[PDB]
């Protein structure tokens, strides 16, 4: 939840270009910090700078919430220096300025990146201070200090420390840190009920929730640029010759009953309708996985179910999961979120993972939702019987694209084109457009930012492989 990050760069002629990569990584990192809605207080320090703010360590920016102005100041006013100064003094100044920040407001985790030794050992390994050392590669005092830090971090972390070095090529070709966007979830305590005798407390979580938006689009006037000068007014004009206002109490919630509209009041509905009172999360029945088909997987929310947050309930749920798994038994659950919830029917099936075993639940449709559309079967339609040459062509096309790692038998097949791990490109496009607007409020038409295509498109070698079967199919037709 809480994070504390500071910037310490070995900027100068030594980066002359890795300096450009470091600059753009810094810009995208601060953009992610701004757009991620984080409560981190960033601070910037400078070393070997003209003027004294007191050891040639001049402090530039204190701690505050990230914003567009800070990024613009970083982009503009921060330029490489031509002075040399001790970086140990810069580290000491950073620790001194972070001491009062820690005292005033407590944090949780510290993370530092880059693109005597006793003091470092004491300060870093004290409570939670940590950093990841990224290299621009793939003077001699700088090299020896770098090596010292290398042994410190591999001794502090171990094998994980050994494999925590990535080149800028691995930060640009592949993605190293680019997915700092996430939404928080609310836990739902509940109690699973089996008939009348059994009632076991459970914890329910929204496993797969549909994409939302943190903010909302605000309409402002082109001159006042504020919602306070906009008054949204909606009125009900009576169906008379002119405009005659009708107030809300004179409005009746009529319903189109066939060819007629019958008056009704929403309060009357509550008076003379009924809903499932309280929470009703109870099993309804059991059947086989064969009967259940993906064609009846309606709804949007995916509800993963764990044990209540006891352990006896946890092992009972695990045993039930195993019992449903080995027999391929699927249970029917009547779901009610709360007292006011709509009565829902769905199916929950066990979730198998090495770390833990979960019970994911999905909703099921009523017969009203299901619809029938009789069609003509094409597998026996002689008027559209496929040609065996077409069969050969499509067979040659099918095996052309093999996104899985079907090369080793001792190792499982792995996707060469992962899909489910790709976020919504629209949110990133919106963020980039907002950044363009902040930087260029006068320049219109933000660029389409084509580099989002590459991870959104199949691998180039896959396309080249596909080029041949598509070519031979095109000649076929």
């Amino acid at each position: 939840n809480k994070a504390a990050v500071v910037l310490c760069m070995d900027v100068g002629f030594t980066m002359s270009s890795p300096f450009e990569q470091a600059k753009k990584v810094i810009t995208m990192f601060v953009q992610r910090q701004v757009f991620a809605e984080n409560k981190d207080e960033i601070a910037l320090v400078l070393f070997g700078t003209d003027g004294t703010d007191n050891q040639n360590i001049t402090v530039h920016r204190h701690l505050m919430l990230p914003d567009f102005d800070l990024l613009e100041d970083i982009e503009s006013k921060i330029q490489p220096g031509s002075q040399q100064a001790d970086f140990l003094d810069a580290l000491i100044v950073s620790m001194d300025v972070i001491q009062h920040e820690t005292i005033g407001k407590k944090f949780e985790k510290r993370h530092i990146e880059i693109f005597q030794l006793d003091i470092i050992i004491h300060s870093l390994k004290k409570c939670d201070i940590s950093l990841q050392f990224f290299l621009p590669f793939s003077t001699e005092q700088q090299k020896e200090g770098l090596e010292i830090v290398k042994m410190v971090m591999i001794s502090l972390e171990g094998e994980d420390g050994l494999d925590e070095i990535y080149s800028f090529s691995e930060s640009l070709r592949k993605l190293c840190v680019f997915k700092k966007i996430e939404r928080h979830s609310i836990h739902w305590p509940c109690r699973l009920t089996i008939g009348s005798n059994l009632s076991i407390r459970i914890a329910a979580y929204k496993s797969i929730l549909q994409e939302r938006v943190k903010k909302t689009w605000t309409v402002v006037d082109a001159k006042t640029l504020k919602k306070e000068d906009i008054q949204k007014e909606t009125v009900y004009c009576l169906n008379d010759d002119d405009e005659t206002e009708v107030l809300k109490e004179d409005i009746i919630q009529g319903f189109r009953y066939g060819s007629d509209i019958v008056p009704f009041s929403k309060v009357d509905e509550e008076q003379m309708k009924y809903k499932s009172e309280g929470k009703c999360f109870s099993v309804l029945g059991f059947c086989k996985s064969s009967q259940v088909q993906r064609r009846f997987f309606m709804g949007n929310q995916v509800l993963k179910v764990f044990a209540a947050r006891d352990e006896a309930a946890a092992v009972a749920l695990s045993s039930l999961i195993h019992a449903l798994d080995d027999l391929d038994m699927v249970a029917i659950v009547r779901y009610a979120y709360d007292k006011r919830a709509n009565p829902q029917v769905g199916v929950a099936f066990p979730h198998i993972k090495h770390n833990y075993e979960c019970l994911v639940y999905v909703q099921l449709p009523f017969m009203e939702d299901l619809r029938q559309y009789m069609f003509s079967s094409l597998k026996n339609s002689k008027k559209y019987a496929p040609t065996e040459a077409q069969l050969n062509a499509v067979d040659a096309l099918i095996d052309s694209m093999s996104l899985a790692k079907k090369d080793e038998k001792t190792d499982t097949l792995e996707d060469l084109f992962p899909t489910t791990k790709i976020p919504n490109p629209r949110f990133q496009r919106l963020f980039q457009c907002l950044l363009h607007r902040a930087l260029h409020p006068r320049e219109p038409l933000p660029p389409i930012q084509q580099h989002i295509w590459n991870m959104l498109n199949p691998p180039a070698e896959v396309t080249t492989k596909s080029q041949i079967p598509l070519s031979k199919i095109k000649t076929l037709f």
Binding site: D67, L198, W217, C287, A323, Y373, V394
Partner: protein, 476 residues
């Protein structure tokens, strides 16, 4: 295929009573409710043959028209209820008589005229016949010949008549007069299992571009759609008439009415107030040309049901402007045994719309023993969740395993596909029909979705009682 599915009801008002007539009324009853709640895009009529007070457009004798072909209405049911039950029966014999002459040719002619009077697009001409006799037309052979000729003429026209048995057993085929050209539904029209929506066309047609240029026409059908209540209509508390709403933008006590061009879109991040435009905002959501381009193929092993998205759809082979699309559909669909490597594509309905990656699962031809194709072969348009769709995840002896294995095996369910209905929707329907029709004191239906309490216990036995063998059950 827009049009109307007409149906006319005619009953023996001169021979059933010279209860059987009451049963006909009850069977007719609630059919209007079923059509109202199912599909109002249809017309229904009721005409009685044999009466002292005849009424028809051609003014033939013993032909009485109560309701002509029109969409079912609450007033129609309310007025028909005057002739419901025994009191309704005696009212029927009072205000319009009974036991007059019958003329099958004349009633066929007048109902054909009624169908001719229809102005809407037509879909299906159906006639439902109620009579207590299998051969009540043992009269003059001239009338029989005329009736048979008229029946043949209307069948050639497309009018289809269906006659069903009644209180009279009617051994074997029976229908000694109607068997020449015409060859139960008491419960079907009496069970009144009324819950249905409309059916019209399908989803948008997409250009299946295999690589960059070859275009394949497709048709997307949605077999499952979430049910929703009919939209409320704002009425007037004094006259119950619809009120047209009006909304406009005001500039907070200056006088002018702000046009949509006058205002601008905005968002607030931190310190800055980023300003956009409506056209700009809608241009943000545009990514690419809508279409269906194939990403490749991904095996059905890197696809687990724990991750799920908006409900999948069905795509059907369509040939709208490209010839040979159906042939390619046939070629690809039969590749299902070897094509376990599901193909990949990104679904873009239209432009200015965010694209979604969607896998297509080859559906096979599920022909039934009744030689009826359910779920015709196609592709399941399963939506692939994105990275931001997953939230945080929080952190067994075999005897127990066998215990609830026996528990779940003793009590089960066959999982009928159509056996669960939303109680809110059906109870709302009951409320509407109660406050709009007879049974003016409201009634409530019963929902099968509620789990049993003792019937399930009996079918399971008392095993669960001694199956509380977990030490210190987690009950608080």
């Amino acid at each position: 295929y827009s049009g109307r599915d007409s149906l006319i009801f005619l009953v023996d008002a001169s021979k059933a009573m010279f209860t059987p007539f009451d049963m006909s009324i009850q069977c007719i009853q609630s059919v209007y409710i079923s059509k109202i709640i199912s599909s109002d895009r249809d017309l229904l009529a009721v005409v009685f043959y044999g009466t002292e007070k005849d009424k028809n457009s051609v003014n033939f004798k013993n032909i009485y028209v109560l309701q002509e072909l029109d969409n079912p209405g609450a007033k129609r049911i309310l007025e028909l209820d005057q002739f419901k039950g025994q009191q309704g029966q005696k009212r029927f014999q009072d205000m319009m008589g009974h036991g007059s002459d019958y003329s099958l040719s004349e009633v066929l002619w007048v109902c054909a005229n009624l169908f001719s009077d229809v102005q809407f697009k037509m879909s299906h001409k159906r006639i439902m016949l109620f009579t207590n006799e299998d051969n009540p037309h043992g009269n003059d052979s001239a009338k029989a010949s005329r009736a048979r000729t008229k029946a043949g003429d209307l069948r050639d026209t497309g009018i289809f008549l269906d006659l069903m048995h009644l209180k009279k057993p009617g051994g074997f085929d029976i229908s000694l007069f109607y068997r020449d050209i015409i060859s139960s539904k008491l419960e079907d029209l009496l069970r009144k299992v009324r819950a249905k929506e409309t059916r019209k066309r399908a989803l948008s047609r997409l250009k299946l571009k295999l690589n960059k240029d070859i275009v394949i026409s497709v048709g997307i059908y949605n077999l499952v759609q979430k049910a929703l209540k009919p939209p409320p209509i704002k009425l007037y508390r004094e006259t119950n008439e619809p009120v047209k709403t009006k909304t406009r933008t005001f500039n907070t006590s200056t006088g002018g009415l702000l046009l949509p061009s006058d205002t601008k879109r905005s968002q607030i991040y931190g310190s800055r107030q980023i300003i956009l435009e409506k056209e700009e905002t809608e241009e943000l959501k545009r990514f690419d040309d809508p279409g269906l381009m194939l990403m490749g193929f991904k095996p059905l092993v890197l696809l687990k049901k724990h991750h799920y998205l908006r409900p999948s759809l069905f795509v059907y082979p369509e040939e709208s402007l490209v010839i040979g699309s159906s042939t390619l559909f046939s070629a690809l669909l039969i590749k299902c045994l070897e094509k376990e490597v599901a193909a990949l594509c990104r679904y873009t309905p239209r432009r200015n719309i965010p694209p979604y990656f969607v896998a297509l699962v080859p559906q096979e031809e599920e022909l039934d023993d009744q030689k009826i194709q359910v779920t015709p072969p196609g592709f399941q348009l399963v939506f692939l969740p994105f990275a931001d769709d997953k939230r945080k995840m929080p952190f067994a002896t075999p005897e127990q395993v066998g215990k609830m294995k026996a528990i779940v095996e003793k009590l089960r369910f066959t999982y009928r596909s159509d056996s669960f209905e939303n109680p809110v929707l059906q109870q709302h329907f009951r409320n509407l029909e109660a406050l709009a029709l007879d049974l003016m004191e409201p009634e409530q239906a019963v929902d099968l979705t509620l789990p049993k309490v003792e019937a399930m216990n009996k079918r399971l036995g008392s095993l669960v009682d001694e199956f509380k063998e977990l030490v210190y059950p987690p009950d608080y």
